[PDB]
Amino acid sequence: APDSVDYRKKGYVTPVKNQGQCGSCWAFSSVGALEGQLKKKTGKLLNLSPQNLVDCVSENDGCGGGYMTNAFQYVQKNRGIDSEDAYPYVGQEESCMYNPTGKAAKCRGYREIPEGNEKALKRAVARVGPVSVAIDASLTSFQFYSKGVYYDESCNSDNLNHAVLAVGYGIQKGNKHWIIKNSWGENWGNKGYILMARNKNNACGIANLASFPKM
Ligand SMILES: CC(=O)N[C@@H]1[C@@H](O[C@@H]2O[C@@H](C(=O)O)[C@@H](O[C@@H]3O[C@H](CO)[C@H](OS(=O)(=O)O)[C@H](O[C@@H]4O[C@@H](C(=O)O)[C@@H](O[C@@H]5O[C@H](CO)[C@H](OS(=O)(=O)O)[C@H](O[C@@H]6O[C@@H](C(=O)O)[C@@H](O)[C@H](O)[C@H]6O)[C@H]5NC(C)=O)[C@H](O)[C@H]4O)[C@H]3NC(C)=O)[C@H](O)[C@H]2O)[C@@H](OS(=O)(=O)O)[C@@H](CO)O[C@H]1O
16 A cells, blocks of 8 residues: 555546536546556556446436445446447436447446445555545535645545545645546646545544445
8 A cells, every 4th residue: 555646647637527407427427437447457548438328227316316336236236338429428317328339448347445444445555556436515615615635524434415526635734645536627627636534533424435346
């Protein structure tokens, strides 16, 4: 477990996307973890399709919400997920238009990080790569974050309302953190990214619903 890990500079991470008004944060989170794992196994970085998941994962609720565990399981049992280009993001619920032709990645299932364990998450991130996580992002301070290690006293580790991607971790001026890729576009936060407090009593429920795909 190195003292600092950032998979953006190891080439595992694609640009920041925009989910729009659709509750598909889970789909981008999952896509992102699969992208990171695709790069690790094959050496190719490629945008995967959140729209495929939104439309085709019945185990979830489309733009109404969903978990990353169900997405990984669907991709596994579907024997594929399309690239972004083969199944573009629209920001709305549609019929499942999965095309085996545009298949860009596969998945042998998923592993879950033990609940509430940031040290376990730390090892998972260091060993596997980008990990899908869920957090409380309902606070005003989160909306208008820009710089620094994000910490807020009112953050509920029980109200998991937003799914994001943990691309690494580190320390900024003594302040331990998680490097978090969001899907609210480049104009949110620090270029679409946010640093969130780490080893600070499971802040925002960062380590409560963490998972990664098997490839
Ligand atoms: C999941 C799995 O497969 N296993 C689990 C079981 O284990 C747990 O997880 C493992 C895991 O792989 O994650 C275990 O990993 C171990 O984790 C420890 C703490 O979590 C340690 O990691 S760390 O403290 O977080 O860093 C331990 O790692 C050691 O960490 C450093 C250290 O020595 O303290 C590292 O060594 C130094 O590394 C740096 C840079 O990496 C540098 O090396 S180098 O890259 O620059 O070449 C440095 O340099 C030296 O420089 C010279 C010198 O100074 O003299 C010269 O000697 C050399 O060039 C070089 O030595 C290194 N210096 C030293 C002192 O080493 C290094 O990463 C490592 O030594 C890490 N070790 C391993 C093997 O992974 C973890 O311990 C377990 O907690 C277990 O799970 S359980 O939950 O624990 O129960 C079982 C259940 O029974 O389940 C399994 O699946």
